[PDB]
């Protein structure tokens, strides 16, 4: 089997419907006969009993610890994964056709392929699919720096400002092998993105790809995007 979908829960079903139901339904629509779901334990370690009350074909719910991250979540399920990893989240309701990111993962044999939908400044090549840079001022002392080798190999890099991460990744086996071999990573969204973006700027190397959609948008953990979730689910869940 090509993919093993992993759904993260780090601080949940507060809305017109369950927040866990939309990612699982999206997964169970196109394939994904077995789904590994990670339960939450930071806010309350009792949502897994709320996770086993759905009507899906097959779910794998595991208990987790309170103080844990997404990189620790992937390092926790390392002896039970044997193929590529397709990471998800709970608060992510997307009307985007999922097969674009998987087509970019298969067609170019990328090492990581991600999906964004219109803070974090990203630079993607003129083809629009392969990313080259991403940074925020949370960890930047200086304003912005660009490596010289990526300007010698890619002379024009289109930057984007309003793009937010929908947290839909496509990891390979050796990426999770290096993540398990390097226990200093705690948040995989800031670790697997920036370290692989730096290591791709080396010939024989790795490929990172991204799809910028223009159909819908994801949500957030806070109450800033909790008002549009019901308006999205009232007009987008009728077709699903």
């Amino acid at each position: 089997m090509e993919f093993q979908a992993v759904v993260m829960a780090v601080g949940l079903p507060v809305g017109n419907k369950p927040l866990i139901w939309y990612p699982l339904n999206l997964l169970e629509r196109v394939g994904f006969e077995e789904v590994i779901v990670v339960t939450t334990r930071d806010v309350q370690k009792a949502l897994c009993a709320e996770f086993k009350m759905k009507m899906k074909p097959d779910i794998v719910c595991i208990p987790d610890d309170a103080d844990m991250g997404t990189a620790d979540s992937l390092r926790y399920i390392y002896p039970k994964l044997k193929t590529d990893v397709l990471v998800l989240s709970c608060d992510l309701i997307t009307d985007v056709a999922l097969h674009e990111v998987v087509d970019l993962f298969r067609a170019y044999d990328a090492s990581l392929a991600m999906l964004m939908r219109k803070r974090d400044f990203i630079g993607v090549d003129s083809t629009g699919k392969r990313l080259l840079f991403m940074a925020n001022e949370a960890d930047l002392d200086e304003e912005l720096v660009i490596k010289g080798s990526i300007l010698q190999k890619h002379p024009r890099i289109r930057f984007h400002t309003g793009l937010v991460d929908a947290h839909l990744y496509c990891l390979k086996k050796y990426i999770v092998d290096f993540l398990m071999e390097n226990g200093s990573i705690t948040s995989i969204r800031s670790e697997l993105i920036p370290y692989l973006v730096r290591k791709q700027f080396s010939l024989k190397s790795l490929d990172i790809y991204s799809f910028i959609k223009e159909a819908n948008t994801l949500n957030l953990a806070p109450y800033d995007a909790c008002w549009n979730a019901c308006r999205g689910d009232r007009w987008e869940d009728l077709s699903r």
Binding site: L144, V145, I146, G148, L151, P155, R156, F159, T161, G162
Partner: protein, 426 residues
Amino acid sequence: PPLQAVLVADSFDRRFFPISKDQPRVLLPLANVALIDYTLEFLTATGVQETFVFCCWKAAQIKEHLLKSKWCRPTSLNVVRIITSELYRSLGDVLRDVDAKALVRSDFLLVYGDVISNINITRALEEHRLRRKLEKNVSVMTMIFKESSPSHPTRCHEDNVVVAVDSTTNRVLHFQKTQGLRRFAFPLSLFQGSSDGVEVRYDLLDCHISICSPQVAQLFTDNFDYQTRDDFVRGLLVNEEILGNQIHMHVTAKEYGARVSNLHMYSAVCADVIRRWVYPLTPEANFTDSTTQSCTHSRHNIYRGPEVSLGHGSILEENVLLGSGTVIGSNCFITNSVIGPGCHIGDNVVLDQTYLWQGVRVAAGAQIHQSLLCDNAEVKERVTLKPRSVLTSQVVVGPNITLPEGSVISLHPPDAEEDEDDGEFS
């Protein structure tokens, strides 16, 4: 409205030394035609009705050179204005002199005197006039770049230019060079000021054909510290809420445009001219109507002049131009080279990537690679030249004297590496 232009016929950098101590850089010929003739032909084919030529150093020689040309004839549609002064020493001095004289009216071109191009910029001036009519004279300068890979030998490391612009409205937000910089630093207020789109561009070769509004001369009159063009854009981009003046940009992909400031830029632009990259401006077309410069185009870009008198065994394979009256001996091997008019070549010689000007005299057995020989030169037998050698204004090289890679020999002792004679040893 008419089309004015400012031509800086004296680039004030000390780069063509001591070649510039004989004859200014804009009078040096690529293929038997000086650079100011190329720039005036580009301006006349653009649609410029009036130019303003500015000359500081060796200006009388430039004046007597261009007075017998095609553009100062009464039949010329492009009238020139020869303006010289011994006081100005920079491009900002030229533009503040223009502002003090009030020559231009609106939407005038600004170009150097050593710019090789064939771009018709009517689309760029349409966009500039539309932006000036829309934003009520807010956008001032419209720079012009050419799309080029950064690995090309035209753009050298001294003037590789990286910009950060908008892809939607083509406005310039950041501008810098790569003069000894491995990691490039970009500001962050350009992203907050324009949240609709932004792009970085390293694929842009600078042509220095920046068409301007007369507010450029206004800002050059105000800011006395702005000495040249990149000083002006680097002072204009960092100060945005004071003296707003957003510079816009045009990118050319189907036409050629460049300038010269090295031996590398000279060699690359000359190799592009011989390989017809600046068509229609080709040496066999004779855009400057002179009988001493007309050529015929053979196969493999071989340009042959009149009365050449080739010998037996002399082979010309690729990119060879032969001027008027240059005699060539037997068993020669010439490739990728420009030969001037009235030269004398010996026997059993090789000449690759070389630029022989007029009046030179090459003896037998000489092997010349990637060099430059200026006017009235001479070289004896049993000499072999190395790449990046410069011979300047009748320097004689004696027998059994091989020059190293770094070699510039002229009549002036401290500006060149040495001064030669009938014997090369001192």
